[PDB]
């Protein structure tokens, strides 16, 4: 099974993508991620995506 650096934060309240650093904060605290940010998908719907890799 491929190890993927990024994973959508399941069921995250997208409204929080409006808050600076909030997806990053919640990814790191709630998921032990290295970081997180919100991203627009191909239809421009926002999702909070956690990142488990270092850069
Ligand atoms: Na931010």
From Swiss-Prot:
Cystine crosslinks: 5-53, 17-38, 23-48, 27-50
Locations listed in the record: Secreted
GO CC entries: extracellular region
Chain positions found as Pyrrolidone carboxylic acid: 2
Keywords per UniProt: Antibiotic, Antimicrobial, Disulfide bond, Fungicide, Pyrrolidone carboxylic acid, Secreted, Taste-modifying protein
Gene3D superfamilies assigned: Knottin, scorpion toxin-like
Keyword Secreted: yes
Gene Ontology biological-process annotations: defense response to bacterium; defense response to fungus; killing of cells of another organism
Domain of life: Eukaryota
InterPro entries, A to Z: Scorpion_toxin-like_sf
Assembly and binders: Monomer.
Summary of the function given for this chain in its UniProt record: Taste-modifying protein; sweet-tasting. It is 2000 sweeter than sucrose on a molar basis.
Family membership: Belongs to the DEFL family.
Protein name listed in UniProt: Defensin-like protein
């Amino acid at each position: 099974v491929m190890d993927k650096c990024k994973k959508v934060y399941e069921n995250y309240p997208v409204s929080k993508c409006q808050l600076a650093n909030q997806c990053n904060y919640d990814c790191k605290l709630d998921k032990h991620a290295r970081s997180g940010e919100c991203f627009y998908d191909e239809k421009a719907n926002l999702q909070c995506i956690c990142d488990y890799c270092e850069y």
